Amino acid sequence: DEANIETHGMVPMNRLTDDPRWLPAMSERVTRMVQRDRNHPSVIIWSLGNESGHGANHDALYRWIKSVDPSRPVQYEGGGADTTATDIICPMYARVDEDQPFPAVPKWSIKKWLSLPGETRPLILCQYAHAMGNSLGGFAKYWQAFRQYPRLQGGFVWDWVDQSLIKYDENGNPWSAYGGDFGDTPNDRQFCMNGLVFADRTPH
Amino acid sequence: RRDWENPGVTQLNRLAAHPPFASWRNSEEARTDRPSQQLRSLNGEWRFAWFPAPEAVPESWLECDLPEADTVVVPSNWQMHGYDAPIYTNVTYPITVNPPFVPTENPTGCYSLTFNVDESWLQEGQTRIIFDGVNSAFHLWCNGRWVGYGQDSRLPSEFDLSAFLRAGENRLAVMVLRWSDGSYLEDQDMWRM
Amino acid sequence: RRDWENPGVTQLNRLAAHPPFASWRNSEEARTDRPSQQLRSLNGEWRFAWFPAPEAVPESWLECDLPEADTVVVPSNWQMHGYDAPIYTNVTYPITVNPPFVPTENPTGCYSLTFNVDESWLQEGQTRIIFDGVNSAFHLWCNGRWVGYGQDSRLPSEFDLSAFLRAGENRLAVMVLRWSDGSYLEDQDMWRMSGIFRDVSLLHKPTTQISDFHVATRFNDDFSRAVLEAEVQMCGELRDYLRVTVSLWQGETQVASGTAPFGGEIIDERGGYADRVTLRLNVENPKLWSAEIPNLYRAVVELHTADGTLIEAEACDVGFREVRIENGLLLLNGKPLLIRGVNRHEHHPLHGQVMDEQTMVQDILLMKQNNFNAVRCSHYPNHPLWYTLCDRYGLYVVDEANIETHGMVPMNRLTDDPRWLPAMSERVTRMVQRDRNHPSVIIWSLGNESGHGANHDALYRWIKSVDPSRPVQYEGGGADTTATDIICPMYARVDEDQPFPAVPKWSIKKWLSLPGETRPLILCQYAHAMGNSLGGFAKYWQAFRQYPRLQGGFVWDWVDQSLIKYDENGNPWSAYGGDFGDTPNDRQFCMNGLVFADRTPHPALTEAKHQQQFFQFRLSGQTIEVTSEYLFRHSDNELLHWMVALDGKPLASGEVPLDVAPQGKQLIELPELPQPESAGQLWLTVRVVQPNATAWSEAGHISAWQQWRLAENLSVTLPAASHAIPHLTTSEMDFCIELGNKRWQFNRQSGFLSQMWIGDKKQLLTPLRDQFTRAPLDNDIGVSEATRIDPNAWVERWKAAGHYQAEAALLQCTADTLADAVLITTAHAWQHQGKTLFISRKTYRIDGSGQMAITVDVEVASDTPHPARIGLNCQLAQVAERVNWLGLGPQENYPDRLTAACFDRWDLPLSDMYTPYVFPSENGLRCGTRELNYGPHQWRGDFQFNISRYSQQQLMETSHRHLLHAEEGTWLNIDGFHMGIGGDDSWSPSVSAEFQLSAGRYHYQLVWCQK
């Protein structure tokens, strides 16, 4: 269960989440969620949001949850996937054997990540294997690694269903549309369709 | 006040958050998770009019239905009814980055509903309204009087309407802003509606 | 909108918080900290009108002055101008608890000011107004148009007035609400006042400006190298020709300087901060800052263009020091501190809560002179100047957020509620944003007495995360929660546990070692100096010295919060809770200071000074070993003076220069002790004197002392045959003795000495009778009240037992004539409801020499509460100018508070023998006295005494010192034994067992003779 906090378009990504003036607004997004969902057994882990860098607001909120609900781990991927705001190493799109050593926020091979000096946390990818179009090549490589390494405990595939929308042609026949098909611009075109299933639930 | 351009105001008069309630008045119903007569759905046909900015909304709408409005089902996203376009942008914000401000042409959906309330709900007790999801911020009025405001498009906003309703017919008016300072915290890679 | 009843709205249009700015446009002025033309004070004469509620404020006031207003000075608290009454309530909120609402009758102060603004401030740049302190919330209008709103009475609220002002005359309107939802977070134990009580100023900054800067100093392992790192942020349009230069100065020498254009390092997938830049300056062998030697450098941050043109400059003092907790110890520059601290409220008896530099400096100097090295800002961020003075004079400071919700039930009802997280967060974040560059701040505190809630844990981590350089502490919820790096209890005792449920206060020695505990423990409040208090203070100090992890504490507290009131005649007097009609109130509980409101010291201050000395001594043989407790400085401004005296008469003395390294020892051998030619006890006193003046003391300043007994030669020499023999005259009702021109009369029905004559002059106004009670101290009373008795308080135990009502019943009174003397024997029982509480047996033996030897043997029933004292008292007929004694002094001292006192011969004017505590009680005792002289009388023995124009009766019946009146003659209380005064706290019995008169049978003897 994840708070409705994502500030991906900011520059740098944590510009708001490291800003105390935004702590109140962010706090209610996390606190109100826990207040509502904390009795559901299906929720096993809380998340502080998505792609909002790593800011001090995150640290404060991570502690708040740990204090009010010790029954479930808290994770958050922003800022490098392994900051002080996450009980779990939860990278997005980290590769199995190949490192992608981006500055400040590298995406290490998952097998290697587990063993960096001083690291001891479990690793569960928050997003992996981007099912956009003809894809999922390399999927088995993740599973073989998850089964061999105890601390590689899986992941959440990206993602379930294509976000395509239905439009109607001149003849009234329906068709699947994506970014820019409504005159929207700028837009990110087909990147809104990354699911294992089509928008109507037919499997890819 | 332009509360929608102030991250210091994320709500006005909203009630505290809490787990799912239904106020059963029969324990066996509560045991089996049966529908509660105390928890009523207001989903169905509502009145809706679209405006290009909050500044364009007529004062008359607070007290009376706009003749030009249409009847539409709720819940719904107004883009899906064709009133304006949905936008698919991944990382880049769909509005200029100038926190906490939002554009002056800010699509405003004016929703209203005339509905009945039985005297029995008003003779004792508290009657609250619950909006489980309103994107991205809104003000609420009941029978012409202002009740409150809320942000966070993905959690329920609840208001006590006890002192605002009367037996019989009543009318809600909800002014929903497409963009708000909450939009700054809602940049997920998905259609913007 | 009623924004003042919504914790969700703590401000509207308020600008971000930042460190002190002045927008100098000349770098040298910034270097020297000179007044800046871009920072104007708007303090002075303002207009003001009081209203009972915001609803009563006329709308005309926004546009123009109200003719009914008065002209008053700002800053001020309106209660100090007489507009409404200040309230003194401790825990109970001064308003009904019904968050977030406040009373409808809400005193509103309408202040306004018409002033000029130069077009030069408006033609370019930004003009903002800064309210350093507005209690408790306020709306601001400029030229009739609404600007913004602000809460938090203890941090500055700033607003941009650029668009509201016009060249020439302008008018500000400030509506200040006494009560707001902010008041729920401002329940500290002090007077409840309101108003614009800190500075109001206007600051002009350029459009392209420094909007914030943080300075950090990190060191290598032995502090011989440091890196100064300065992160600077800007507002305005970014341009490639912009630069920031940060230069570091040590006096006139430029130690380092670095320049760079804006553009920070990559932080995440989206990049870095194009509007910030970090300059790193290397510093070799930096001069380190500490309270011992507050070395400071000056950092100047200049925003300019590449061609060299200055845009503006900001600056700050920098102190190179590292604070860290390691292996359970709080270290400063790698050495463990011993905090000799005190809590200090911002209080002035005339001006209320408005602070001035003079009072601040006065406080700091008395503190330092009294061996304090640290101060806790109980319980809110202080006026900005305070931190400047602590940085420069040298004091460690605990900076504390203005959050206290003591009156809630339970105490954390709001702090554990996420809906109050926002409001609380601003009280912590804005404080850190303002004060983080001050070297004197070594620890952050999350507030006070607010229980322990999840909001505390969230804010604890926020701080840890943004400023790793300083530990975070917080006492609420048990003093050792997950929200504190330091175990920091309030009023935990040294050896005794107070196991309250859920938030027990353990003995401090035991607390350190509870299972799994490893942190340092520094009391955030200890030894409550209310009234005649500080009993047992030495016990804390002996434990802090013995246990490494006991690293000191902050005494409660610095200064009495009494306020001045004026009687019919216009004469001033000190007032406390309820004296303004305020009710409910907590009476004298607002006076807990080491000093009176006017800065005069109470006697307890000297005890603190002595227990907090920086030099320890031991004596062996002729050898004195001095050990320095300084961590960083050598004793380079100290000389040891020693003096040997026999019963007060000096025999020898000298001086030796001290040259001891920090933590080192120096041995000093006294020269051979020539023998004395008289019986008597030789005593050695040593003192540490500072020959040279300093920024905080005058030449000659004494910083430490100690005494020891040396050889004693008991007198074995027989007096000598008396030239005369006293005669006894027996009559039915009296036994009279005559000797020369003196006569004594013992009444046979009362069994006491009722009269004594020198010639035809009577010496007594009241007979000499035993006394087992004292006018109750604040500590004896505790929370007890007539309207609500605390039966466990000492005063209630004594009352209930009949101690104050017991009457002497005579058992025996006989007279015998001996070879050279007459002997009177008496026995009395004191009873109550038929129980014998005390029995006193005595002999008075009057001899040929005229001396009357009195022996007293008392029995105290075991089941009666131990008595306050066991002595005699009388009202002498005459009054004399001086009091001279051989015993401990010169100041007032009690059994559990006499370490600072020295044995010697003292002589003071009688009035100095009375301590004017605002709430009167037993006072002025001196203990360990072997001889006392007053008028022609002399008493010799080994007793404790007090002497004054006020009876115990009067003191106990009078609640305010200004109402006491000198009685005829002089009341003398001479005690064989006197109970300790306690003070670990002033709301529960706190006199340690060893200081209670529980022995059951007591003996003392005194000789009264003429001089």
Ligand SMILES: OC[C@H]1O[C@@H](O[C@H]2[C@H](O)[C@@H](O)[C@H](O)O[C@@H]2CO)[C@H](O)[C@@H](O)[C@H]1O
């Ligand atoms: O389904 C899209 C996916 O995008 C990832 O973001 C990518 C983005 O698509 C690409 O244009 C840019 O080069 O890199 C971004 C990664 O830094 C998001 O991380 C993921 O959450 C999805 O939104």
Ligand SMILES: OC[C@H]1O[C@@H](O[C@H]2[C@H](O)[C@@H](O)[C@H](O)O[C@@H]2CO)[C@H](O)[C@@H](O)[C@H]1O
């Ligand atoms: O100077 C007073 C002191 O009060 C303490 O609180 C006491 C209070 O005085 C007593 O009336 C109540 O019965 O017990 C309280 C302790 O729980 C505060 O702890 C201290 O901060 C001071 O305010």
Ligand SMILES: [Mg+2]
């Ligand atoms: Mg808002």
Ligand SMILES: [Mg+2]
């Ligand atoms: Mg039914």
Ligand SMILES: [Mg+2]
């Ligand atoms: Mg009707």
Ligand SMILES: [Mg+2]
């Ligand atoms: Mg994203």
Ligand SMILES: [Mg+2]
């Ligand atoms: Mg408010």
Ligand SMILES: [Mg+2]
């Ligand atoms: Mg308190």
Ligand code: NA
């Ligand atoms: Na595994």
Ligand code: NA
């Ligand atoms: Na996508």
Ligand code: NA
């Ligand atoms: Na110690």
Ligand code: NA
């Ligand atoms: Na007090």
Ligand code: NA
């Ligand atoms: Na010296």
Ligand code: NA
């Ligand atoms: Na008294």
